[PDB]
Amino acid sequence: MIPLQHGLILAAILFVLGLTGLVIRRNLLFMLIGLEIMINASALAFVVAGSYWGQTDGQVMYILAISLAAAEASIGLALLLQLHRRRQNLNIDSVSEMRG
Amino acid sequence: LLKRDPLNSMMNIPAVLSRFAGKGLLLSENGYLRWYVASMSIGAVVVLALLMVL
Amino acid sequence: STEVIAHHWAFAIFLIVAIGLCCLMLVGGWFLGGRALRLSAKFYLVAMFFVIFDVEALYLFAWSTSIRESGWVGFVEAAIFIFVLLAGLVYLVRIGALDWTP
Amino acid sequence: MEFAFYICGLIAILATLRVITHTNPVHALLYLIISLLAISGVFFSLGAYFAGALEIIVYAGAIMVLFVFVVMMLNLGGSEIEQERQWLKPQVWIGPAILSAIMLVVIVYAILGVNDQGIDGTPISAKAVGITLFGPYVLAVELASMLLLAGLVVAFHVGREE
Amino acid sequence: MTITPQNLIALLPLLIVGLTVVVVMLSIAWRRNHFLNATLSVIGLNAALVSLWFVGQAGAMDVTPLMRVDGFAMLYTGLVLLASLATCTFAYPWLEGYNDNKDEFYLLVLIAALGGILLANANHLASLFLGIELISLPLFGLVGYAFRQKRSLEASIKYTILSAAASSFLLFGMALVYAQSGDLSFVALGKNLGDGMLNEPLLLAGFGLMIVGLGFKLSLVPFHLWTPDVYQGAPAPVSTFLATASKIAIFGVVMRLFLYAPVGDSEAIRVVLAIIAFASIIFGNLMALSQTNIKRLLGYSSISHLGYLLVALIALQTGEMSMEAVGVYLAGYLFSSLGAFGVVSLMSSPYRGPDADSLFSYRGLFWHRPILAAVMTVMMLSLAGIPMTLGFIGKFYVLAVGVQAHLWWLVGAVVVGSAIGLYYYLRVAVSLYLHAPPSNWQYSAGGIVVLISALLVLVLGVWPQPLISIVRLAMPLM
């Protein structure tokens, strides 16, 4: 009753929005937020694809995807806390000491 | 006229082009994370556009 | 059918009536009546431990509803999973990550 | 059933667009939680009951709690975040939005050229996910436990105070 | 698919590395002993390496819908285990100067090795994704293990953000492929199509996004910009692991993906990979010209060498010796990078505090460290593809494979990039031999590792037949 292409288009829209939020924001926190949006959109795409074929592999890939999302969020927020501790700011333009 | 060995300079020309191209390519390594994300997205656009064209 | 759509209508009515009840409770409260330190890192640590062990708990949630269908093979696999989980928990306890008192 | 899908998808898109453009981190995280609830409703409209259950349990109930906790610990009372509004300048966001719109156009053009018989929405219960999770996909389960242990050790080592 | 005990025999190195992770973590929970935990980690990695023989006795088969074990899997499991053992050996003298905790390093190295083994045995998109993340997240920890150092924290943040973005791209591409195909197995990606309908747009777009994620992980142009920054900022044993084991395991699973998939011989995907390989070779050689820092130079070197490997990968569907060429080149590049990054690790060990530098200062090394200078100059000659070195044998294999499949643009790219590489590698070597103004057995073990790598490179450069014989012996399931 729901077209597969509609669910895939919804997932693509959310992935594109997450990527835009990851690019346009100097704050490290909003970059992590955009990463969470992107990985959740990819997991949503896996669920849509699994529900189309009637297979249980889509929700398995969702489970692995949100395990990755949880662990990456944990690591990224620990790094954010360390950056805020030792530099007292979260602007990512200032973290550019290696170049060339 | 020839005492500076012009053919040697004509064969040294590719080294000059290689140094200039390397200096031009090193401007992408500015050290900014947002530019690295942007370059990844640009390359994704380029790869997907090439796959759709071909 | 009719029983499942009746239960769907009942659940939808339940959700909207409860939400509307709390919303109009605040609306009546706001409408009636006259008018005249350094944050320690242990909180992040325990929140992250909650996140990780909640994902492992989700795996065990999936296993628990189909224990008979997976058999003793699934029991061995889940025992390995739970043993790795408990080894991580013992590690976190022993390195003082879960000790709050000095 | 399709009405639930379309309404929740619209809410998810709008909430995500409000997330990436807002300046206050708490309101951005609240909009993100709203989008996660909308995506869970999308999952429930597609028969993936376990996926929607974990979308509210884990993604909206554990990960966003961690983000909220970090935002609290940062003590953001206007600490070089609210004052700038640099991303709203068109010279900053027009380029990346154009790039992401081009990427969206290419992906949607790829998606629209696929064979589509529709999603029947037959409920795939958590019993089937548990059967296939501890059957064919069980090395994935054990190594996902190892992945979570890796994230645990990494985040503990980085995020200590001393 | 169920698991028989013979399938557990085929599961042996994964099981031994996982049990090593559990045992090392329980030993850390007992008491923080650096020497005991390092010994347990290297004992577990050696046990997996020698259990590869019992895996070879079992035979090639499939343990799951996910894992397939064969000679290909054994070869890349061995390469990953060798890189992990070398990383632990280099990490001990560097960690002796680290005033904070030291054993979480070995725990993360073990987990990353487990991810590499899973990528070696992978036959499924789920196993591919899980192996990539299982490699990437311990690398998030290890790249910023010295997070008090500014450059290490910078490299950790950059690698974490960019690798999460790449994993999102890879996951979304796999989701689109699964939407088109309906099966996540490698052999069923494009199987439902036929008779010229292979270039389906959703399948190609999903493979494109997967290519974006994988080419991030393989430091391929234009997903290459992180590599010098992360290689420079990371600790030197972490740079060793990230240059060797991650690239080797991910390129092995990419070889499996493009070998088994019916869409892997698509003309559009072949042309896109040709463009990526050409740009990778040329750009990674051109950007390493004016590099005065050895870490960034080796990062651009990694870009160029992965481009050469990609050239070998493009001719996989046309030729037949492409798998053999990739195996020989991967062994040569493994030993070359192990020696080079090991010399860098030994001269940067012990870790002299977070507030001090971590520079190598390669000028005039021979007059106080002659053996390390000899090893480093052999490694620089090997990375240049100069004969009497194993890197030349790899480059010869790549050129033979490219000539066999009429990939003339890639052949010219290899020639030009090899000349540019000759320039900067020779500059590094003569800087070693110019003029400039330890005391424990683990530093001696690191020196023995880089010396054995140098001897292997020289001997297998002048006599490459044993390596070719053991690489042709590793055939996957046709």
Ligand SMILES: CCCCCCCCCCCCCCCCCC(=O)OC[C@H](COP(=O)(O)OCCN)OC(=O)CCCCCCCCCCCCCCCCC
């Ligand atoms: C008959 C023509 C047709 C057939 C051609 C067949 C190809 C093989 C035979 C021709 C090869 C020509 C290559 C010429 C290279 C010259 C390199 C050189 O002179 O290097 C020395 C120079 C270092 O000295 P200096 O200038 O002081 O340094 C500046 C900062 N270090 O170094 C530098 O300044 C930088 C060096 C950069 C790297 C070396 C240059 C590589 C250029 C591409 C190599 C492949 C060329 C292919 C053919 C092109 C057309 C001839």
Ligand SMILES: CCCCCCCCCCCCCCCCCCCC
């Ligand atoms: C060809 C492959 C590599 C072979 C070995 C390379 C050299 C290894 C080290 C041997 C000893 C070198 C001694 C150099 C002395 C330089 C003296 C200069 C005086 C002006």
